Design a protein around this ligand. Sequence first.
Ligand SMILES: CC(/C=C/C=C(\C)c1ccc2c(c1)C(C)(C)CCC2(C)C)=C\C(=O)O
Length: 137
Amino acid sequence: PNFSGNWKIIRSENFEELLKVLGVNVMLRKIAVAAASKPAVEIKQEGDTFYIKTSTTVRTTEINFKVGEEFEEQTVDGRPCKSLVKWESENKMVCEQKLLKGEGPKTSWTRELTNDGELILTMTADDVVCTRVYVRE
Ligand SMILES: CC(/C=C/C=C(\C)c1ccc2c(c1)C(C)(C)CCC2(C)C)=C\C(=O)O
């Protein structure tokens, strides 16, 4: 049950559709979609403590959190939110997000370590689901 490692993406689907439901104009979606197809992901895990750095040419995010403890991060479209991660199963964590200001689509994410050694990340916005699959570099 160790997510630690440097991960590279091998499959991504419905990412643009995700941004579309968030109301991002076409020009910006193009820039985001292009850069998001080549992320560099670093994860450091110790017990329930996580450090996840996701880097792209146009944006880098770093989150630090303890499963079960509320923290603050940003939605995919850059809006400040309060998040809470819980273990849904032994190798699957689910995160429920809550906007700090205003309204918007219900968003969340999940990260799961599969039995073949891969990592599946799913990001949701209302009914749209983006699936991203990684493998260690
Ligand atoms: C890599 C990844 C996600 C990458 C997302 C990127 C780059 C992204 C997302 C949204 C945006 C931008 C970039 C830029 C900066 C163009 C500004 C416009 C908005 C609409 C605010 C997820 C993962 O795989 O964990």
